[PDB]
Symmetry: D2
Subunit: 215 residues, 4 copies
């Protein structure tokens, strides 16, 4: 799994919005430590958390399992353009069988499958991958029908955009130890992809200081 | 699949809302044909389609594939509580093998899988189902790990709540022949599950 | 201000929804006290908050000031149909002057204005109300223009619908002492209008 | 009224998003003629219009009326941070009267009021402004109470963010001849503040 932050809204956009409520520009730093500190003090007060919505982040996500896509898509206050299995499963036509399950076929399978910490499941996923490319390549069955045999370990790719407020929500919900392992990884990857200057607005989301049982 | 409308907002909620913008209550016929056509007429003037949002429908959907869930979840202006593979895959631990593919095992497999119009794909789905069961039952692997080998054709179950405005959007987009067959079927099942008196509001959005 | 709950989703709906997640129906008592206990329990766990969304409330709000409407419409996850000033200001076309500010007039003025806890501002509102009446009655000036001289204490009427999850968020924010006094009343009024058994889902929001 | 686009998402963020769906990266020309044509073509196909949501526009709106704020706040798929009358009304505590009304005092009133195409209604606004000032100055009454005598023509200031998809919707709904004049102006203004490169994505929405 690889996550990249393709674009982000400059920090002061948020400080400029906050001061607009109280008309306290006279105390503006134009992006100085005072303004930055303001976004964190006001932006984190629930009644005024909406101020962080002005901050947007354009990410790219590679290698996420479709099973994890099921969960990512539930965060409805965000935008995504996802690789369609309906429009792209043909990618398995000109591909060699993944069986027998030898050392080099397993590695080849990783291009299309997300492996987890259990050799047997990974094996089964590859068996599902093989049967899938058999339907698509050897019997030219259409994507719309063949997709039904595809394992959720199958890899997806997506462009993902989300504002700061919704992102704190995502990180709080997914960095939690109650979330699927892969999703916890997505959460961290997202945070890490974030520009150093903005991370202070999301750090406490990985700490769970209000509900510590999540770590 | 199976869809049932467990509850819906009475039509007069929307006609009363509409008449509030203009305070045109004197024209109300108490939830009669006038108020009914008012909902459809004003509800279709784009600048006032929000008025339809007051209408809410609570559905129960049984038999939808995970692959179809993947698409349904993309309609954001809606609420849903879905059966979790992370919390319910232990349902395969003590079940009988799905192989061979005799009639009783295929019937049992249909309780867990959606079959499409291709005998080979379904055979494959049943094979993926069996491996999933084997991972869960004998190798006793935990849900968070085994769910990765689960085939998207696995059946899901969920409660689905959406308002009239978001529903028209769904029916329009998913009844299109551009949509996945299962989704087209979903749109139709959603429509057929709607109380008769309300269908006139969504009829124009179907097909 | 007056608030009325015209319709609401039955409780067992969120009850049936939560159980769909774990497929724990055998434990259900058909909306009983055990299922009712469930809604509040799981409903308060943040990762399952979404289960409260299946519950929808259809309210009618009378007498709210436009100044408060300014704040209420900022809650984006709700639906509303509001009396339009652009479309209904002629309601003043045929009304007798509100001056002098005697007591019988201060009373009539209340039919169109929200009075607060201060005689002087209320007086200014009537004067503003009177000047608005003049623009509309004597000079017959269009609504789109005359509306600019309307005091924010002018009353509005609206159909308001919102789900449990968003309502909790509302009651919590607007019942705070940090909230404009009128909004605090609105929160209390929405809570009081709720059917008996639904009120436990929102009780703590007022603390 | 003044509008400034403080920041925006580069176009290829959208073309990269679209291409991700079909994995058609090979035909990309890195935000060139091809990718631009792609946004306009795919981005306007309803089933794929969500691809435009990736473009975000950060604006600044100066001198908009509260009457207009009332309608602007109804577009819930957008973000806004608005000047608060509850926190900033004391700005009238040190201003001289606007009475008697005269070329000089009217001019001064424009600093706090939005004027319209009707001198009588503008005059009535200043009179409303004078009373609001009095409540705040002469009697030092709290903003929460005084604000009730404020005319909807009072000026506001806010930071406004919204994505391409929601913006097309807004421009279509507000540039319309059915919308209040000021909103038509805000629509035109927002569109003009956009960078030329992005205007071809909104031109058909406007007029
Ligand atoms: C550990 C874990 C376990 C889960 N288990 C299940 C499960 O078993 N079954 C299941 O179906 N889902 C499950 N989910 C999905 C989860 O319930 C939803 O993703 C979540 O409820 C959406 O809420 P959100 O806050 O993430 O909203 P987002 O959509 O990510 O963000 C929107 C925010 O806006 C508000 N909002 C948005 N839409 C609405 C609305 N329609 N009504 C009211 N407020 C709204 C909310 O306050 C929300 O926080 C689980 C998630 C986690 C992290
Ligand atoms: C035939 C078909 C093919 C598809 N192919 C792909 C594909 O290849 N890749 C892919 O990633 N997706 C694909 N999708 C997903 C689809 O693009 C999204 O589900 C859809 O765009 C979300 O828009 P909606 O109108 O369904 O919104 P819903 O979420 O169902 O409803 C919300 C409505 O509110 C508005 N709205 C909601 N959220 C926002 C927001 N964040 N910004 C602005 N306005 C908003 C919109 O006007 C929208 O119509 C496909 C869908 C269909 C029907
Ligand atoms: C005491 C008080 C003081 C206030 N002062 C000001 C002020 O000075 N200036 C001002 O402009 N406003 C002010 N407001 C308005 C307030 O900021 C908004 O009403 C509020 O931000 C809307 O947020 P919400 O959580 O109530 O969302 P709702 O719109 O009521 O509900 C939606 C929920 O979904 C989520 N959500 C919705 N939309 C988005 C989005 N676009 N991005 C991310 N998450 C989203 C949120 O988590 C939210 O809780 C004040 C409100 C109060 C109660
Ligand atoms: C000329 C004109 C006249 C008007 N007259 C009145 C009037 O008399 N009374 C009155 O009360 N209002 C009136 N309005 C307000 C208007 O009806 C609302 O602002 C509007 O309906 C909100 O819809 P939207 O498309 O602007 O949504 P936005 O909130 O701007 O954008 C969100 C988009 O997402 C979708 N969406 C968002 N929320 C929901 C939801 N809860 N359910 C379903 N889909 C959703 C929609 O497709 C919508 O287009 C008027 C507006 C105009 C332009
Ligand atoms: O950690 C979780 C568990 C469930 N879900 C939601 C989204 C899917 O629609 C459904 C998936 O359930 P699982 O297959 O992840 O168990 O419920 C999540 O978003 N995150
Ligand atoms: O008809 C479609 C095609 C794609 N998608 C969206 C939602 C999923 O996140 C992803 C699924 O692509 P498919 O697996 O359906 O091809 O894109 C749909 O909703 N409907
Ligand atoms: O308690 C408050 C204070 C401000 N606002 C938002 C919504 C309006 O757009 C604007 C109103 O500022 P006031 O007129 O309430 O001061 O900011 C609220 O919603 N609630
Ligand atoms: O052109 C209009 C007419 C009405 N409204 C909505 C939003 C406000 O809540 C209420 C305002 O009615 P007017 O004051 O604009 O007449 O209805 C608009 O957004 N735009």
């Amino acid at each position: 799994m690889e996550v990249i932050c393709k674009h982000y809204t400059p920090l002061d956009i948020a400080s400029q919005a906050i001061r607009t409520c109280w008309q306290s520009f006279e105390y503006s730093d134009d992006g100085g430590c005072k303004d930055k500190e303001l976004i964190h003090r006001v932006g984190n007060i629930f009644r005024h958390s909406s101020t962080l919505e002005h901050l947007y982040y354009n990410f790219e996500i590679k290698g996420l399992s479709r099973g994890a896509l099921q969960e990512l898509s539930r965060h409805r206050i965000a935008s995504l353009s996802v690789k369609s299995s309906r429009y792209t499963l043909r990618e398995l036509k000109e591909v060699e069988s993944f069986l027998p399950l030898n050392e080099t076929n397993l590695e080849r399978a990783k291009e299309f499958l997300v492996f987890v910490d259990n050799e047997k499941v990974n094996a089964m996923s590859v068996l599902a991958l093989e049967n899938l490319r058999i339907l698509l390549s050897e019997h030219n069955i259409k994507n719309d029908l063949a997709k039904y045999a595809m394992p959720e370990s199958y890899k997806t790719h997506l462009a993902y955009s989300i504002n700061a407020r919704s992102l704190q929500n995502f990180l709080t919900l997914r960095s939690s130890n109650k979330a699927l392992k892969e999703m916890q990884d997505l959460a961290k990857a997202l945070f890490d992809a974030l520009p150093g200057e903005h991370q202070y607005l999301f750090e406490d989301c990985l700490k769970h200081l209000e509900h510590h049982h999540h770590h």
